[PDB]
Point group: D2
Chain length 266, copies 4
């Protein structure tokens, strides 16, 4: 009579999967992902750091762009994550197999990564990806140093329990540039109020808005570039319209408050 | 220009996903999966055992058929696996979350289950599923006893390194029935000779043919029923045409030898 | 010349290892550990819950006391933890092997449990125990229900990142009794200020004092009974001198402030 | 009355813990462990390989000897294991935290490593150590190549299910030297016959004797040097009395047959 449905892969907008050549953000920091998914390469004299990798099928493209930058597989030392959803941590397992890279993440992100995004608090098994293990667990405010670039973790739970902003100082034109890679603050299709799987969701989002507002932030980047008004396809003006961290937090909070009101009405 | 491809879910023949009501094999043993994927429920006075669950989307159907048999979620004590591919272990993680069940498997199956079938020796990441942890590691020839039914593991590596046959004795018409749930012996699209990820593949398959030939085997069942000539949709004659274990092993070896010859020619 | 030192097991006060018979706390709640380590059995019509198990060598004693209470290994459904140090989660792995029990814990506790307490933020590898996997990850404020007893998690990070208080309502003399199993608030030998492995340690402890002060709390119990002024060897007056949650929090904060001052002076 | 016993660390002969300076075996291969535990450093132009690390407390000594050889923590690329007992894999977790090293092991060794040697088939929880994750699972006969040195795995189950011999070709005096690092073939205190946790133990040991006898083997090394008649404290004559692989296998089989006969008589 009626068979059970076939499994459905989550399909994304084509721009999320559109390869781009490396785009320089600061002296050591490059966008090497796709037009609409951030994957940041930070290059140091002592090896490279990758912050996010995008979707699972982006692994080979990332390695190609690393090679274009002078980074061989052995040179990739560290993978950091904004959060462990399939569209940001998708290729981590494959990257670990193909490079020297080790993963550092907080406990919440580590457990979600280790189950490949399955049993998501909001999406169930709808967006799974290959599981990976974290090599180092980080705590809030902990620093990790690679070739003299210091990365600081700032927990900003909400979009996932383990959502993290990463900050570091690079240079540009001889002057320091405080880069803030702030995580998503969206809640796409989430039940916000009275969620049995995330009872303090609203409190965590409100704290996370405050955390983002206060980040050291000359340049804001986000996992989805549109969230911070980056346009990676716009070349020399890709970052011209980027939001401040304050503006990003304010916009996210206004959207969140609207969603809460609609949820109450729905 | 050209975006990377969207992820593709592996889609299966519709009969693999066609629910069926429980079909009794022996006094305590029932097929509760789909028309073309085996999932065996063994019911004892001390709880139930599930051998395989089929595809990931079959979890709720399995629980429905268990309930029809008098088995509540708390009553499911043990999940055993033939091998940890998505079409047999697919729903294990969800079943563990929704029942009291613990998983027993050999080390090879446990590591493949824990990575959700990713980095498959032959399929890469093409057939992933939600990862799950094994609660007990079993060795070759080890027995597990549930409510007085004794299950014996017989390793038969090849289709996966961890492929296992499970045997137990049930009853029918007052007489013992030695049931052999023998794993797949297919090698679908595999590189058999000189495979760097499985150097002794051919030797393992040949040993596994010999293991299957020698199993205690009044009734053979297989994860794909067609492999042992079962027809789960045929009601009272579902098992009438079933192969012996000897015939199953011989047929698998003849097919394997043909594949080897074609590989040499290709 | 001089060999490396032998490994040293952490040895504890003998009272921590002194078995005791079950001591009833409320209609369904029993202390079944040792004189100086709490292990709480909550018995319901639908199976039993264990909160903490004490030291690794306590597994058989716990099972003996469960049997004395009418709880067989199959009847133990759930293990909850205060925190995943060796003196409270020590026997969890063995209990999972020997019972039907599944573990529910927050992500921080799950990752520490899965590494058997190794690489502790403060103790390094000095207090390891057999690793175990969590079956369910809980979020702050999440409830788990067993046979109609509702357990609520209240995160109180500090002693470990994953430290949790568990609350439930039992009965006594026909009246509700709100039981609070609050975790340790000690910091034994910890570097409190400027700790690179726990940068927000002090902030987390201060929040945890406030959490404990506000718990629903007719009866306070603690992993080390002396912390809440229980005397499990005192029979019918074991709980007579027990602190309120408010008094426990106040005492812990005063001790913490003294330790901070001594650290500044040392 | 009588408290439960304190945990007992397994204490080893002092020579197992006696540090030694690096002892050269061949052009790229050095013993860097203790007088009575092997830990082999293989140095290549593309990074270093460590085969075994000895006991848990040896991590810092290993890193000191690596530094003496010109190998920094970032230069250690790969850890291979003979088997995952505490006296050979003890420091692996710490080495992974402190170096760039990734672990490659077979599935049996990986699962035992991941539980820190707990629930050992023969020793129970008597010899635990800090758990570690494997980064790569290897199959029998699989090769791993580092800086042009090719390591081949030869499974030799028995002492543990995952016991592995590793072979590679180095040079000495301009000529190839086929090095065989063969695992332990002892069965210390094991129940050999009818062991429910290892039903095919005897068959596996007999196959492993045959595997060892046939290894490519100009120079045999073993995890316990005395098993192959090495004397690491004897300087320029440390390896003079070393057994062939054939002689090692024959001696192990004669000892095994004697143990079997004593077990039958006991
Ligand atoms: C679960 C995954 C597959 C998923 C699916 C679908 C959407 C998202 C978003 C998301 C939501 C809103 C905006 C608009 S905006 C100006 O940024 O508010 C953006 Cl750009 C992205 C995110 C995310 O935020 O990570 N994830 C999604
Ligand atoms: C990786 C998964 C998704 C997959 C995909 C596609 C096919 C299979 C088979 C398979 C092969 C041959 C036969 C014909 S026959 C009379 O049995 O020789 C049968 Cl029925 C099944 C198997 C398996 O054997 O498990 N798995 C497959
Ligand atoms: C790491 C483990 C093995 C360990 C070792 C040693 C001590 C503890 C304590 C601890 C500290 C203070 C008090 C005095 S008091 C009135 O309670 O402030 C108490 Cl009772 C217990 C704890 C703990 O609190 O869990 N753990 C310890
Ligand atoms: C479980 C651990 C802590 C343990 C404890 C105690 C002994 C061993 C041995 C062992 C056995 C026999 C020989 C004598 S001989 C000439 O080699 O036959 C040797 Cl040297 C070593 C081994 C091992 O073989 O790995 N492990 C032991
Ligand atoms: Zn997301
Ligand atoms: Zn996203
Ligand atoms: Zn298969
Ligand atoms: Zn199949
Ligand atoms: Zn503690
Ligand atoms: Zn304690
Ligand atoms: Zn050993
Ligand atoms: Zn040994």
């Amino acid at each position: 009579e009626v068979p059970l449905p076939q499994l459905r892969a989550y399909t994304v907008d084509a721009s999320w999967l559109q390869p781009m050549a490396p785009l320089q953000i600061a002296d050591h920091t490059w966008q090497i992902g796709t037009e609409d998914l951030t994957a940041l390469l930070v290059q140091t004299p002592d090896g490279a750091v990758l912050l996010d990798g995008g979707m699972p099928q982006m692994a080979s493209h990332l390695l190609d762009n690393m090679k274009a930058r002078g980074v061989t597989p052995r040179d990739l030392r560290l993978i950091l994550l904004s959060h462990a959803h399939a569209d940001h941590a998708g290729p981590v397992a494959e990257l670990k197999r193909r490079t020297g890279a080790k993963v550092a993440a907080n406990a919440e992100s580590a457990v979600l990564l280790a189950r490949g995004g399955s049993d998501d608090l909001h999406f169930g098994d709808g967006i799974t990806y290959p599981p990976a293990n974290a090599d180092r667990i980080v705590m809030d405010g902990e620093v990790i140093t690679v070739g003299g670039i210091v990365f600081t973790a700032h927990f900003m739970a909400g979009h996932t329990p383990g959502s993290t902003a990463w900050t570091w100082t690079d240079t540009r034109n001889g002057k320091p540039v405080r880069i803030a890679y702030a995580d998503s603050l969206s809640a796409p299709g989430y039940q916000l109020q009275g969620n049995p799987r995330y009872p303090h969701l609203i409190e965590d989002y409100r704290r996370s808005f405050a955390t983002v507002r206060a980040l050291p932030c000359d340049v804001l980047l986000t996992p989805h570039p549109g969230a911070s008004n980056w346009d990676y396809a716009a070349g020399a003006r890709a970052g011209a319209k980027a939001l401040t961290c304050k503006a990003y937090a304010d916009a996210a909070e206004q959207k969140f408050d609207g969603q809460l009101a609609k949820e109450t009405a729905g």
